[PDB]
Amino acid sequence: YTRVVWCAVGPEEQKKCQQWSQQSGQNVTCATASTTDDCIVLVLKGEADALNLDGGYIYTAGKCGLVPVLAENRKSSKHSSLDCVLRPTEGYLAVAVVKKANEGLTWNSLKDKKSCHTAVDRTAGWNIPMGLIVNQTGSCAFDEFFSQSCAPGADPKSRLCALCAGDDQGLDKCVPNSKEKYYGYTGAFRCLAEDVGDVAFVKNDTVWENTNGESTADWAKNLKREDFRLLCLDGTRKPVTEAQSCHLAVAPNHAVVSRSDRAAHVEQVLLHQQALFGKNGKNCPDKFCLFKSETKNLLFNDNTECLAKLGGRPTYEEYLGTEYVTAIANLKKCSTSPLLEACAFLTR
Amino acid sequence: YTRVVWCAVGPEEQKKCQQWSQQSGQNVTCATASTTDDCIVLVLKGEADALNLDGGYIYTAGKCGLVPVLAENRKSSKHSSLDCVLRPTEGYLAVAVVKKANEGLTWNSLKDKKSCHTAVDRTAGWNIPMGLIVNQTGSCAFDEFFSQSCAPGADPKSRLCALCAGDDQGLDKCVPNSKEKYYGYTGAFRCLAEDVGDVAFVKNDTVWENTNGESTADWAKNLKREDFRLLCLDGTRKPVTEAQSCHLAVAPNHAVVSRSDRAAHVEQVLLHQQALFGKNGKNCPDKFCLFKSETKNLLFNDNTECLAKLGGRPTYEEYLGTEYVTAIANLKKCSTSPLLEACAFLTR
Ligand SMILES: *[C@@H]1O[C@H](CO)[C@@H](O[C@@H]2O[C@H](CO)[C@@H](O)[C@H](O[C@@H]3O[C@H](CO)[C@@H](O)[C@H](O)[C@@H]3O)[C@H]2NC(C)=O)[C@H](O)[C@H]1NC(C)=O
Ligand SMILES: *[C@@H]1O[C@H](CO)[C@@H](O[C@@H]2O[C@H](CO)[C@@H](O[C@@H]3O[C@H](CO)[C@@H](O)[C@H](O)[C@@H]3O)[C@H](O)[C@H]2NC(C)=O)[C@H](O)[C@H]1NC(C)=O
Ligand SMILES: *[C@@H]1O[C@H](CO)[C@@H](O[C@@H]2O[C@H](CO)[C@@H](O[C@@H]3O[C@H](CO)[C@@H](O)[C@H](O)[C@@H]3O)[C@H](O)[C@H]2NC(C)=O)[C@H](O)[C@H]1NC(C)=O
Ligand SMILES: *[C@@H]1O[C@H](CO)[C@@H](O[C@@H]2O[C@H](CO)[C@@H](O[C@@H]3O[C@H](CO)[C@@H](O)[C@H](O)[C@@H]3O)[C@H](O)[C@H]2NC(C)=O)[C@H](O)[C@H]1NC(C)=O
Ligand SMILES: *[C@@H]1O[C@H](CO)[C@@H](O[C@@H]2O[C@H](CO)[C@@H](O)[C@H](O)[C@H]2NC(C)=O)[C@H](O)[C@H]1NC(C)=O
Ligand SMILES: [Fe+3]
Ligand SMILES: [Fe+3]
């Protein structure tokens, strides 16, 4: 019980994990599953200790009795005195990104359109958009709102998994891991960019990092921030710059979860692991870099400066926030989750 | 699937249902159909969960296996000090309303006159009046009794839809939906008010709520109780006050139907929904009033205090009463409906 078994989602995450493991000196070891829901199950089973999760998956984890340990933190514009770990979190902005070339496409026209999602149950990609749509229509029929979509983790045979491409060989299409071409923050934007979907739900940070040659990726190099507009709730269209007025909602930062018992242990091991392999670590870029994965945003986001502590001990509720928790719960009235079902009585 | 999908009949009823959704936090969602029979079918397919139905519709939905869940209960004279939900259902009064200014018009001179009906297969508008007329004439030719009628839900290329006026632009003529100017209880009255029809088949409560400026509607604000008289099986006429002695029948109250598998859940959800959004509901009118539309009796009748419980788990037979079932049955031998033919095997 001295080690920390880290759970990896996909093979790409696996290799990056194993590396971390070798260099750590087995202070950190690697478990793997196809999906994040599988990975969380391991943590519950006790075949793994922790992982870093979108807010949405934090909700699923949190309903299964796991707790948040450290939060992802990124380049701030204020309170620059406080150390990265001591600096408070801000929380990314969930947006709706459309091609400027596409005309007449406002928030009120998305009905019967094509969509790109980070994945199912994720905060930007799914919970915030589908929450709002589902609420405005007063319909739990989100499975018929977009004419066609890519939402890794949906029913592979449904129209939410239609526009999904798979890996290089087009196998395991719609899996919610990096192996899916359009998976995660990057994937959703690549979908919109290669004009597979008319809209993509990501965070602004995804926009700025993949346009104006901020990416050497063969899909993101030639990209130009004027060929992309932001759908706002008013109905107006605004440029990427006005994201403070054209954002769908404020997203709780990705966080590490673990069992209540092993939280403090992992807290410690990780603060030391980031001091070594972090953005400013003795062995970055010497041995191993924990916050860099070649635009695959594996294990952590690439935009992660460090991991930070949380004031007091926070419930999955307090972390995400009373309002967002209410938004997910309401959207989850429209679907049936095997995991959430099991945990509901198993951890009661 | 904790959400309860309400079935809304027409776009007005759906606009309230969307509202219901947004305030109930998707504990309730919307499904829409032009007609009530169409909405009964959705409930059979599980595309919706439940809706509030006139007694005659409850025969239709009964025949097709749906059960009753909660009955509308109104302000009572007798036993005023029992909790609305536990106070027994006191029935309501099926009455024939004519303008006083029409002379020699009696129950026994109705032949070849003009009629307004709430809609086809409803209890006050159709099941009782036409049930008796056939029984008196000895003929099954109710399609030829009145010269012309409005009877939304009939053949829109027949005499029974000849007086049905439509929406604002006069489209959707005779559709059994609030967009038809003369649909429902209100509509039957407005049809007799504007002297488009010689008689109107409504419930007692319809005259009071639309005469003596008890309604602010342009058509109803100036209506006077003294200008209307109630026809009797006596062959006699009387004013609105003698309704207990000039009424065609005792109608079972409107009620919520659902599929047997989803009743208990629908009952629960609703008991709570009246609690928050009912007559004395904390969120009335601070957020949403469930038994208020605009004299438009949308989703529920506006004269509803609370949806009340029933005695055990009743059937359409028990809740309508063996008398009313046999009267319906004998009228239905005269003319078939699609849904009754389609479902006959279930009840046989
Ligand atoms: C006129 O319509 C009325 C209703 O509008 C019909 O009444 C029912 O008709 C049947 C005959 O098919 C009668 O038997 C029903 O009454 C009796 O109810 C007792 C209960 O005390 C039963 O035990 C009897 O077996 C019997 O069914 C009668 N319903 C009522 C409430 O009286 C009637 O048939 C119809 N008549 C004509 C000529 O059209
Ligand atoms: C939506 O996401 C984008 C992308 O992350 C945000 O832009 C980023 O803003 C930060 C500062 O707040 C920039 O960092 C800067 O670095 C220099 C030194 O290198 C420092 O001295 C400055 O004070 C500044 O902090 C960062 O470069 C920038 N990233 C890119 C690639 O442009 C954007 O703010 C987000 N939008 C909203 C409305 O929040
Ligand atoms: C929509 O969703 C549910 C429908 O069940 C509602 O939440 C439930 O509401 C009750 C409040 O009446 C919650 O707490 C209760 O407290 C009383 C004590 O005062 C206690 O006797 C009850 O057993 C219960 O603990 C209840 O926990 C809650 N259920 C859940 C799972 O959250 C909600 O109010 C509905 N909202 C709307 C706007 O319709
Ligand atoms: C025929 O229809 C009218 C309208 O539905 C009924 O008149 C209603 O009479 C009831 C008594 O049963 C009245 O309720 C009372 O309300 C007062 C306060 O307004 C309260 O102090 C009393 O204790 C009582 O509960 C009700 O106001 C009245 N409604 C209207 C709009 O006039 C009548 O009951 C029906 N007639 C028959 C023969 O069933
Ligand atoms: C769903 O959308 C509706 C509005 O379209 C939101 O409900 C309104 O919110 C305000 C502020 O909380 C309430 O006071 C109003 O009464 C509501 N207006 C209407 C017209 O119902 C609702 O908050 C939205 N749901 C979510 C999860 O954001
Ligand atoms: Fe996220
Ligand atoms: Fe009725």
- Domain assignment present for A335: no
- Domain assignment present for A346: no
Same domain, A60 and A102: no
Same domain, A138 and A241: yes
Tell me the residues of B at the A interface, defined by beta carbons under 8 Å apart. 1-3, 5, 17-22, 25-27, 29-31
- Domain assignment present for B346: no
Bond into A11 cis (ω within 30): no
What DSSP state is assigned to residue B159?
G
Structural domain span for residue B159: 74-254+317-327
Residue among B51, B24, B28, B56 at smallest CA distance from B40: B51
Pair B154, B172: CB distance under 8 Å: no
CA distance B129 to B148: 16
- Domain assignment present for B66: yes
**Residue A301 CA, ligand 4 centroid: distance in Å:** 67
Same domain, A62 and A190: no
CA distance B172 to A311: 61
Same domain, A99 and A226: yes
Q: Which two tokens stand for residue B236?
A: 């006699």
Residue A167 CA neighbour count, 13 Å, CB half: 10
Q: Which long-range contacts (CB under 8 A, 24 or more apart) does A261-270 make?
A: A262/A1, A262/A4, A262/A49, A262/A50, A263/A67, A263/A69, A265/A1, A265/A4, A265/A49, A266/A4, A266/A49, A266/A50, A266/A69, A267/A69, A267/A70, A267/A309, A269/A4, A269/A27, A269/A28, A270/A4, A270/A50, A270/A69, A270/A70, A270/A307
- Give the H/E segment covering residue A346: helix A338-346
CA distance B225 to A348: 61
Pair A174, A152: CB distance under 8 Å: yes
CA distance A347 to A64: 6
Pair B325, B317: CB distance under 8 Å: yes
Q: Which two tokens stand for residue A307?
A: 């991991």
CA distance B154 to A103: 45
Which method, experimentally, gave rise to this model? Answer: X-ray
Which residues in A lie closer than 8 A to residue B18 (C-beta atoms)? 137-138
Residue listed under structure tokens 């319906």: B328
Which residues have a Cβ under 8 Å from the Cβ of B284 and sit 6 or more positions away? B277, B278, B290, B292
Which residues in B lie closer than 8 A to residue A333 (C-beta atoms)? 2-3, 25-27, 29
Q: Which two tokens stand for residue B286?
A: 């601070």
Is there a contact between B26 and A140 if contact means CB atoms under 8 Å apart? yes
- Domain assignment present for B335: no
Same domain, B247 and B296: no
Same domain, B312 and B322: no
Q: Is A238 helix (H, G, I), strand (E, B) or coil?
A: strand
> In sequence order, what are the beta bridge partners of B229?
B98
- Give the H/E segment covering residue A342: helix A338-346
CA distance B117 to B191: 9
Residue among B189, B217, B190, B216 at smallest CA distance from B205: B189
- Domain assignment present for B347: no
Compare CB distances from A334 to B3, B18, B31 and report the shortest one's residue.
B3
Pair B277, B24: CB distance under 8 Å: yes
Closest chain A CA to residue B47? A141
Same domain, A53 and A80: no
From residue A261, give the alpha-carbon distance in Å to each of A84, A159, A257, A347.
Answer: 26, 41, 12, 14
Q: Which two tokens stand for residue B306?
A: 């609370």
Is A319 annotated as contributing to ligand binding?
A: no
Amino acid at B158: S
Pair A140, B26: CB distance under 8 Å: yes
Compare CB distances from A140 to B3, B17, B19 and report the shortest one's residue.
B3
Domain count across chain B: 2
**Residue A8 CA, ligand 3 centroid: distance in Å:** 37
Residue listed under structure tokens 């977009």: A146
**What is the resolution of the experimental data for this entry, in Å?**
2.7
Which residues have a Cβ under 8 Å from the Cβ of B147 and sit 6 or more positions away? B112, B113, B114, B159
Which residues in B lie closer than 8 A to residue A143 (C-beta atoms)? none
DSSP secondary structure, A62-115, as one string: HHTTEEEEEEEE---SS-TTS-TTTSPP---EEEEEEETTS-S--GGG-TT-EE
CA distance A68 to A309: 10
Q: Which two tokens stand for residue B183?
A: 């649909």
Is there a contact between A336 and B26 if contact means CB atoms under 8 Å apart? no
HEC sequence for B265-314: HHHHHHHHHHHHHCCCCCCCCCCCCCCCCCCCCCCCCCCCCEEECCCCCC
Q: Which atom of ligand 1 is nearest to the CA of B128?
A: 5
From residue B233, give the alpha-carbon distance in Å to each of B188, B208, B230, B249, B277.
Answer: 20, 22, 10, 10, 41
Pair A73, A304: CB distance under 8 Å: yes
What DSSP state is assigned to residue B214?
S
Same domain, B243 and B263: no
> In sequence order, what are the beta bridge partners of B256?
B52, B70
> In sequence order, what are the beta bridge partners of A50?
A6, A258
From residue B250, give the alpha-carbon distance in Å to each of A129, A204, B75, B243, B253.
Answer: 50, 64, 16, 11, 9
Q: Which two tokens stand for residue A273?
A: 């692991």
From residue B82, give the alpha-carbon distance in Å to each of B74, B78, B190, B307, B311.
Answer: 13, 10, 35, 14, 16
Closest chain A CA to residue B16? A138
What DSSP state is assigned to residue B326?
H
* Strands annotated E in A251-305: 255-259
